UniProtKB/Swiss-Prot annotation, chain A:
Domain-level remarks: The C-terminal 24 residues of isoform 2 are required for its function.
Gene for this chain: FANCD2
Native species: Homo sapiens
Protein name: Fanconi anemia group D2 protein
Family of this protein: Belongs to the Fanconi anemia protein FANCD2 family.
Function summary: Required for maintenance of chromosomal stability. Promotes accurate and efficient pairing of homologs during meiosis. Involved in the repair of DNA double-strand breaks, both by homologous recombination and single-strand annealing. The FANCI-FANCD2 complex binds and scans double-stranded DNA (dsDNA) for DNA damage; this complex stalls at DNA junctions between double-stranded DNA and single-stranded DNA. May participate in S phase and G2 phase checkpoint activation upon DNA damage.
Length: 338, 607
């Protein structure tokens, strides 16, 4: 009886009551153009949109109805998209459905895997990925920033990495700024933010600043995220900066704050560093230079010797060179038996 | 000790005089491969030096000369002993797996400038043998997925092909490659996006499943949406997508509409859907210029080719709904108007001389190649439509006459400069399947329902010589690289069947109709059809010895041991040479004789 269900029925989608998927009578483009010309030529042009979305929100109050609207439709006539993505394909509907998608998203913060083990808010943000047309880029950005601020930790971990799918190729600067400003506060979310910052289109001197910023706070990271961050740092070296970053890393990595609780994480970390030096030869040389040039500091750590034996056992050019260096550390009293 | 042995063995096999005298000695090759059998029990001391010998033989004797007998064949034979050592050592010694398979990878990833085919072969062999015994050494693979962005593309495709058998069985390794490809989808380098596209096409191409079986379908749809967005990037990524979409269809039928609309919408940016508008493709949008740097985007030719292949497959397979008829009538409108276009709709030959000095000549040259590709695709379409209608063959002739006018244009303009550009000898957009069928229908076919209609094609000699030229181009592509350019141009079995079919047809035209029927013109005596058929025969016989060595029985059976079949074929060829000789011709085409002794030199290695 609502305008929404009537227009969808004459458009050619059978609305299921909410267990199995919604059926399709026509094709996707046919339905989209059908509803477009239907809403175009219909009288009362600037109010049928608000009536449509009011009927929509009143319909998707129910969990099953909304869950089926989010899930992909069924071809009766061989398998296509969801009603929400098809509806967001139409530019004149887009921002209203965006708004009523984000207004009801704080309803599903604490809702997690009730019946079908389908986590809802990831299904909500699924329908914004790879949009053909974006109207309101700034508004969409500010809305996801409000959500990414206010969200639970798991939800903001999820949506933050699905950012590059969502945004076009314009509005990346302020997004980078807000995410880095989130990074200085929250250290639990270091791993996906860095993941993303290379996966946007940022200026390189923003990335180097965030890299310096995370190496500054490298001690304040939980143990599980540590090999991932070191993986990021080592994967993001050039030929020119390598020694400064490696030497910061040599001076800042301790193994007296993380020591089946700590041993597994250290195993993983050494696996990362082994696999870095194996697949990239300049990190070995960089790292012998970072220990050999430490002459004054008779604060040599454990990390210096375990690194010397790993670069010995792997790439086997270094052997004469680590014999020489390690001789010159024992005469000098710098490395000792304890 | 291993390179010397193979020198010695080549001397004996090349000469009977030494075979009579020397009684058959065991060679170092067989001894090493005996050592490896013996080593299973307890000899672990010995096995860590077999691996080092393996990789010394492969690292030292592997190719470089492609990036002679003595520099090649006792180095080719050492490098394949190396790989045999490491594969046999890898099968039975369960502890030098994560040291061979991390040392093969560390050579594949990191060198990438020097040729590393030999390691990819070994890595394919290692996987193919038992990916069941590589789920105990898997993390060494998924650490090389993180280096995948920075590799050249051919290495990525080869290395992704080679691990396919690991991707069949392991779902963790598939879901570890997806995260890397998705992350490199957006990365700022160019080659990372190509490697993502490649990986995504190969995951769509080889797999259905990537837990409810709705999310697999929506995931395929989302991948296809990311690739649909990649369609608006640069030219090469578009071209990769257009080649890939056919193989994506032919495996996963369910993605039919998601592909075809993806092309049709992409066609409609460059198509004008009104009759009596004479350039029926918008060629301006296909070239972009930003301050005198001038480059291509959207090759229309490959797009239409992908459309026509997918559409033909849609007709022949899917129907035995009211969408494909639209694209049919679009293509028919393009043919109908491309016929009654002439040369000033694309401003060709009169106003611009396609000069490689200015931006405008660049634009016009790209335009000309695009129109040439379109005409070739529409030749293949118009052939494919009907059971040999006269009117459609007149349209084929008219399209070919347009293409041939453009070719003689481009040849005269490559006559002022040189033919240094390999862009007209750049591939034809005819499938090899189609050229086989076309030459079978041109020469051999004598069914009266087709004769009246084919007689307009046969009467065009330039068409038939173009057709055999195209078959020669496909065999030269098979020789130079491993495989050919078009559809089904990467499955060796399809190239084998089409090689057999070309052999049959060209033999029938060589032997049945002689050479001394030349009533055309004296420029065609080094370009005659019975000569080009023999040239194609020479290339086929070379290529089938090289690449299809294990099939020469079932190559010849399509034309009792191999000796009798080869003897009968030699009887044909040597009879040909005999009547060529005793004719006592003073002009004496020595080219045909050279090719005849070349094919006989090729054949006599099978007796």
């Amino acid at each position: 009886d609502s305008i929404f269900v009537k227009l969808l029925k004459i458009s050619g989608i059978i609305l299921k009551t909410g267990e199995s998927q919604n059926q399709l009578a026509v094709d996707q483009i046919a339905f989209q153009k059908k509803l477009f010309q239907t809403l175009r030529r219909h009288p009362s042009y600037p109010k049928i949109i608000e009536e449509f979305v009011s009927g929509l929100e009143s319909y998707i109050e129910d969990e099953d109805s909304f869950r089926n609207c989010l899930l992909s439709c069924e071809r009766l006539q061989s398998y296509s998209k969801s009603l929400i993505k098809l509806l967001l394909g139409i530019d004149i509907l887009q921002p209203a459905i965006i708004k009523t998608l984000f207004e009801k998203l704080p309803e599903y913060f604490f809702e997690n895997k009730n019946s079908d083990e389908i986590n809802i808010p990831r299904l909500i943000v699924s329908q914004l990925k790879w949009l053909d047309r974006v109207v309101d880029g700034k508004d969409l950005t500010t809305k996801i920033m409000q959500l990414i601020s206010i969200a639970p930790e798991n939800l903001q971990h999820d949506i933050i990495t699905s950012l590059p799918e969502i945004l076009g190729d314009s509005q990346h600067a302020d997004v980078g700024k807000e995410l880095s400003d989130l990074l200085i506060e929250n250290t639990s979310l270091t791993v996906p933010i860095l993941d993303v910052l290379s996966s946007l289109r940022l200026d390189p001197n923003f990335l180097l600043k965030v890299r310096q910023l995370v190496m500054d706070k490298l001690s304040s990271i939980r143990l599980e995220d540590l090999p991932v961050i070191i993986k990021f740092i080592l994967h993001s070296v050039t030929a020119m900066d390598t020694l400064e970053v490696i030497s910061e890393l040599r001076e800042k990595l301790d193994l007296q704050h993380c020591v089946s609780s700590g041993q597994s994480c250290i195993i993983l970390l050494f696996d990362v560093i082994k696999s870095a030096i194996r697949y990239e030869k300049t990190i070995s040389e960089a790292w012998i230079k970072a220990i050999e040039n430490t002459a004054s500091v008779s604060e040599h750590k454990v990390f210096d010797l375990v690194m010397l034996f790993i670069i010995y056992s792997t790439n086997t050019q270094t052997k004469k060179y680590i014999d020489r260096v390690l001789r010159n550390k024992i005469r000098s009293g710098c490395i000792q038996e304890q | 000790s291993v390179v010397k042995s193979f020198k010695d063995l080549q001397l004996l096999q090349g000469s009977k005089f030494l075979q009579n005298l020397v009684p058959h000695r065991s060679y170092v090759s067989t001894m090493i491969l005996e050592v490896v059998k013996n080593s299973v029990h307890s000899w672990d001391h010995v096995t860590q030096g077999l691996v080092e010998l393996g990789f010394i033989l492969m690292d030292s004797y592997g190719p470089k000369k492609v990036l002679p007998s003595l520099s090649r064949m006792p180095n080719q034979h050492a490098c394949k002993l190396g790989a045999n050592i490491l594969l046999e050592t890898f099968k039975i010694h369960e502890m030098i797996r994560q040291e061979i398979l991390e040392q093969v990878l560390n050579r594949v990833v990191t060198r990438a400038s020097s040729p590393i085919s030999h390691f990819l072969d070994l890595l394919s062999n290692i996987v193919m043998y038992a990916p069941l015994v590589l789920q105990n050494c898997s993390s060494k693979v998924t650490e090389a997925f993180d280096y995948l962005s920075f590799l050249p593309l051919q290495t990525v495709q080869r290395l992704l092909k080679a691990v396919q058998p690991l991707l069949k069985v392991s779902m963790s390794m598939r879901d570890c490659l997806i995260l890397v490809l998705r992350k490199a989808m957006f990365a700022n380098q160019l080659d990372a996006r190509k490697s993502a596209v490649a990986g995504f096409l190969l995951l769509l191409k080889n797999f259905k499943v990537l837990y409810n079986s709705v999310a697999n379908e929506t995931f395929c749809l989302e991948i296809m949406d990311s690739l649909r967005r990649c369609l608006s990037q640069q030219a090469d990524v578009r071209l990769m997508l257009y080649e890939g979409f056919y193989d994506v269809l032919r495996r996963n039928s369910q993605l039919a509409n998601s592909v075809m609309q993806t092309l049709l919408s992409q066609l409609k940016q460059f198509y004008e859907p009104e009759p009596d508008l004479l350039p029926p493709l918008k060629l301006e949008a296909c070239i972009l210029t930003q301050g005198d740097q001038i480059s291509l985007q959207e090759p229309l030719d490959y797009l239409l080719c992908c459309i026509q292949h997918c559409l033909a497959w849609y007709k022949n397979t899917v129907i035995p709904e009211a969408f494909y008829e639209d694209l049919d009538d679009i293509l028919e409108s393009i043919t109908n108007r491309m016929i009654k276009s002439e040369l000033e709709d694309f401003e060709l030959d009169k106003s611009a001389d396609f000069s490689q000095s200015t931006s405008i000549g660049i634009k016009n040259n790209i335009s000309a190649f695009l129109v040439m590709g379109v005409c070739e695709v529409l030749i293949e379409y118009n052939f494919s439509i009907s059971s040999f209608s006269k009117n459609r063959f007149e349209d084929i002739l008219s399209l070919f006459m347009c293409y041939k006018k453009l070719s003689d244009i481009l040849n005269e303009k490559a006559g002022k400069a040189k033919t240094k550009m390999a862009n007209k000898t750049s591939d034809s957009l005819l499938s090899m399947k189609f050229v086989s069928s076309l030459l079978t229908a041109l020469f051999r076919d004598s069914i009266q329902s087709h004769q009246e209609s084919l007689s307009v094609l046969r009467s065009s000699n330039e068409f038939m010589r173009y057709a055999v030229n195209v078959a020669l181009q496909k065999v030269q592509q098979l020789k130079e690289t491993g495989h050919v350019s078009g559809p089904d141009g990467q499955n060796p079995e399809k190239i084998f069947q089409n090689l057999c079919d070309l052999t049959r047809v060209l033999l029938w035209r060589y032997t049945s109709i002689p050479t001394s029927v030349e009533e055309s013109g004296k420029k065609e005596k080094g370009k005659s059809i019975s000569l080009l058929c023999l040239e194609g025969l020479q290339k086929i016989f070379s290529a089938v010895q090289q690449f299809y060595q294990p099939k020469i029985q079932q190559f010849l059976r399509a034309l009792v041991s191999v000796t009798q079949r080869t003897a009968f074929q030699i009887r044909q060829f040597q009879r040909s040479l005999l009547n060529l000789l005793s004719s006592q011709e003073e002009d004496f085409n020595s080219k045909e004789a050279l090719l005849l002794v070349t094919v006989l030199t090729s054949l006599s290695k099978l007796l």
